[PDB]
Amino acid sequence: DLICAQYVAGYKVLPPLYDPYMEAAYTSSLLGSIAGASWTAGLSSFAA
Amino acid sequence: GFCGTGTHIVSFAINAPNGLYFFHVGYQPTSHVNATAAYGLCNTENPQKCIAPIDGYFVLNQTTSTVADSDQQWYYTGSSFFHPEPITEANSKYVSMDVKFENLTNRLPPPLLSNST
Amino acid sequence: KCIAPIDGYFVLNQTTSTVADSDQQWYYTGSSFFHPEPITEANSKYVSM
Amino acid sequence: IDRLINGRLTSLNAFVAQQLVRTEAAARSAQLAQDKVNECVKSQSKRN
Numbered sequence A: 001d002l003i004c005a006q007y008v009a010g011y012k013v014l015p016p017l018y019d020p021y022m023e024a025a026y027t028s029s030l031l032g033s034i035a036g037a038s039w040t041a042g043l044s045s046f047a048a
Numbered sequence B: 001g002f003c004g005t006g007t008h009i010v011s012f013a014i015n016a017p018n019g020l021y022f023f024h025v026g027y028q029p030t031s032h033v034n035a036t037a038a039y040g041l042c043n044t045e046n047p048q049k050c051i052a053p054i055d056g057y058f059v060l061n062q063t064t065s066t067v068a069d070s071d072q073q074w075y076y077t078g079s080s081f082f083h084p085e086p087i088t089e090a091n092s093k094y095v096s097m098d099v100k101f102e103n104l105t106n107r108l109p110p111p112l113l114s115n116s117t
Numbered sequence C: 001k002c003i004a005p006i007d008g009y010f011v012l013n014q015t016t017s018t019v020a021d022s023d024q025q026w027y028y029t030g031s032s033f034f035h036p037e038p039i040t041e042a043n044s045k046y047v048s049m
Numbered sequence D: 001i002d003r004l005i006n007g008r009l010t011s012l013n014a015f016v017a018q019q020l021v022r023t024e025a026a027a028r029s030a031q032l033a034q035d036k037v038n039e040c041v042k043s044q045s046k047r048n
């Protein structure tokens, strides 16, 4: 499933800003920020 | 996360071309220390009384490390700035017993004392 | 002196139902699972009457 | 040929006006996704 109509009709699909490695790093950051992560009143301490 | 990053303290708003412009002032840590913390503290009594911290942590004052379990003297610190102080009824509350709480037999706080005057 | 519960209810342990007002022994339960336990200072607070 | 030129230019104008509104919708929903990450994944929300 390619898009060959690009090169005939005259439009271009632009690639996204990040590659799959960086998106995987973002969701691993989200997964590792779940336990602990400012256990208390403010947001300044980080309890493991 | 609604009012900027960090811990939100105060915000201001001015007029801008076609709208409103916002300045969120937040508290931002730059250095930190690694503290040893307790989940709570027990009594080894009958009936057993247990406390937990309010807006902070029960910590060791670990300026002179490698000490003993009777030298486990516990303090209260606030959660945003490390400064240990005595545990009182102002910074702790009574909770029901949990198996992760440390069992104290000496150096008890005044809320955890067998009250006989 | 008057007390109210914290995150739960003052309930009867009414597995043994049909009691009197002298046999109204009250317990505490947390609001998401029914398990009665004694009322103490760890699950109650002082309120105005 | 000028019929084809004028019709194709009008069609490109409609395509550009469609992509602007879709880009604006996507940028609002990215801000909503940021709120969801901050209040549901990284904390306990008090919002029923």
Ligand SMILES: *[C@@H]1O[C@H](CO)[C@@H](O[C@@H]2O[C@H](CO)[C@@H](O)[C@H](O)[C@H]2NC(C)=O)[C@H](O)[C@H]1NC(C)=O
Pocket: B032, B033, B034
């Ligand atoms: C808090 O504890 C961590 C333990 O993980 C310390 O991290 C280590 O720091 C030393 C010195 O900078 C490094 O050589 C190690 O490689 C670090 N370990 C890891 C796993 O990253 C950290 O420095 C401590 N912080 C303070 C202020 O003492």
Ligand SMILES: *[C@@H]1O[C@H](CO)[C@@H](O[C@@H]2O[C@H](CO)[C@@H](O)[C@H](O)[C@H]2NC(C)=O)[C@H](O)[C@H]1NC(C)=O
Pocket: B061, B063, B075, B084, B085, B086
């Ligand atoms: C925790 O330990 C520190 C030691 O680093 C104590 O700080 C000392 O406090 C006394 C107060 O009488 C001062 O005379 C010293 O000069 C302080 N030393 C330093 C290096 O700052 C601190 O008091 C301890 N905390 C508690 C609650 O006892």
Ligand SMILES: *[C@@H]1O[C@H](CO)[C@@H](O[C@@H]2O[C@H](CO)[C@@H](O)[C@H](O)[C@H]2NC(C)=O)[C@H](O)[C@H]1NC(C)=O
Pocket: B042, B098, B099, B100, B101, B102, B103
């Ligand atoms: C403090 O002492 C209590 C004793 O009351 C310990 O509680 C026991 O914990 C184990 C699991 O480690 C449970 O299987 C037992 O049922 C608990 N005993 C009771 C009577 O409930 C507790 O582990 C001790 N905690 C520390 C940190 O020493």
Ligand SMILES: *[C@@H]1O[C@H](CO)[C@@H](O[C@@H]2O[C@H](CO)[C@@H](O)[C@H](O)[C@H]2NC(C)=O)[C@H](O)[C@H]1NC(C)=O
Pocket: C013, C015, C016, C027, C036, C037, C038
């Ligand atoms: C409320 O009543 C129930 C009876 O339904 C009590 O449950 C019994 O508890 C004893 C000891 O705790 C057990 O040996 C029995 O097997 C239990 N029976 C059942 C049917 O579960 C319960 O203890 C009472 N609640 C309180 C706080 O005393």
